[PDB]
Amino acid sequence: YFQGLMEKYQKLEKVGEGTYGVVYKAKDSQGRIVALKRIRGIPSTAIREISLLKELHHPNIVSLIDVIHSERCLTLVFEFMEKDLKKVLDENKTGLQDSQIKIYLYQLLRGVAHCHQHRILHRDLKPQNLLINSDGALKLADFGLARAFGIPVRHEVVTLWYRAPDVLMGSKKYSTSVDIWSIGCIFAEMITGKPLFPGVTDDDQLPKIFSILGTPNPREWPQVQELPLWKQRTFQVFEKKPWSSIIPGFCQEGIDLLSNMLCFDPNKRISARDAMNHPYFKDLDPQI
Ligand SMILES: Nc1ncnc2c1ncn2[C@@H]1O[C@H](COP(=O)(O)OP(=O)(O)O)[C@@H](O)[C@H]1O
Ligand SMILES: [Mg+2]
Ligand SMILES: [Mg+2]
Numbered sequence: 001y002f003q004g005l006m007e008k009y010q011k012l013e014k015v016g017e018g019t020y021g022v023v024y025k026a027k028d029s030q031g032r033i034v035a036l037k038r039i040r041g042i043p044s045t046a047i048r049e050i051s052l053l054k055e056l057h058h059p060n061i062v063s064l065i066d067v068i069h070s071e072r073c074l075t076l077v078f079e080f081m082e083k084d085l086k087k088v089l090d091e092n093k094t095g096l097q098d099s100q101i102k103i104y105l106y107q108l109l110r111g112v113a114h115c116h117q118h119r120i121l122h123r124d125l126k127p128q129n130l131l132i133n134s135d136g137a138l139k140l141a142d143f144g145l146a147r148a149f150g151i152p153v154r155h156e157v158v159t160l161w162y163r164a165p166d167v168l169m170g171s172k173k174y175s176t177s178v179d180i181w182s183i184g185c186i187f188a189e190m191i192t193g194k195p196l197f198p199g200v201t202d203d204d205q206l207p208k209i210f211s212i213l214g215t216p217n218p219r220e221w222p223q224v225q226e227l228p229l230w231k232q233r234t235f236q237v238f239e240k241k242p243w244s245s246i247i248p249g250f251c252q253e254g255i256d257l258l259s260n261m262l263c264f265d266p267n268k269r270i271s272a273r274d275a276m277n278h279p280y281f282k283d284l285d286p287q288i
Pocket of ligand 1: 082
């Protein structure tokens with residue numbers, strides 16, 4: 001049993017795990033099911049997370065309903081979600097059904113557009129941080145690395161598989177573009193069931209991106225040369241693999257949308273809102 005500011009919660013089964021604690025299923029005194037994310041320098045990270053979550057009230061963003069403070073641990077109380085996208089991809093090793101890719105991508109874009117409109121960047125979008133409930137609603141979660149505009153950035157070993165090439169090259173500037181890259185990586189992962197850029201080491205990351213989309217050309221994107229790592233490193237020059245080989249047989253409008261998400265120049269990359277209005281979503285009800 002745990003006492004919050006809003007209600008009392010009865011601990012049930014462990015429904016997840018994490019770097020600083022365990023996520024459990026839980027029950028309200030009145031019966032309503034919830035999630036308890038237990039958090040063990042670390043209290044500052046949890047405080048940031050709560051403050052950002054309290055600014056983000058949207059159907060496509062995991063709802064924070066309460067906080068339990070204990071000398072030992074900070075417990076976040078969320079609406080319950082049955083699964084996550086990593087778990088969904090594990091059951092579909094060769095990709096998802098086309099209608100589902102379309103549903104999940106639209107909701108992922110809508111949640112991110114809400115973030116961006118509220119001047120917050122997620123910065124850690126990946127299938128395990130994309131929660132899916134018992135009704136198929138996709139919601140953003142884990143705002144642990146989120147960045148509010150104008151607030152300075154303040155370390156855990158995480159995957160660089162969804163990180164934008166300019167960020168991996170040392171860019172530190174605030175850009176909504178960093179999230180759209182991750183969305184592109186996720187979009188491609190939902191098509192094949194496999195990660196688009198799974199570099200073997202943190203060092204292999206940029207050569208892995210470049211091996212698929214080509215090595216960026218400074219005449220096309222002049223600002224590459226201005227980036228820190230581009231100055232202190234030499235990269236093997238690659239030609240872009242055709243989309244016909246990356247995502248074989250996927251619809252033309254989906255390939256066009258993906259290509260606008262995965263372009264190197266952050267100033268040319270499609271925004272979350274413009275991507276929602278792309279011909280690829282023509283048939284989809286926006287009121288989902
Ligand atoms: N609202 C929720 N409902 C159910 N399970 C959840 C919920 N939030 C998180 N989880 C589960 O536990 C993991 C929680 O870790 P997360 O929220 O991403 O924190 P972290 O990765 O920082 O430790 C998730 O990836 C998921 O498997
Ligand atoms: Mg996480
Ligand atoms: Mg965390």
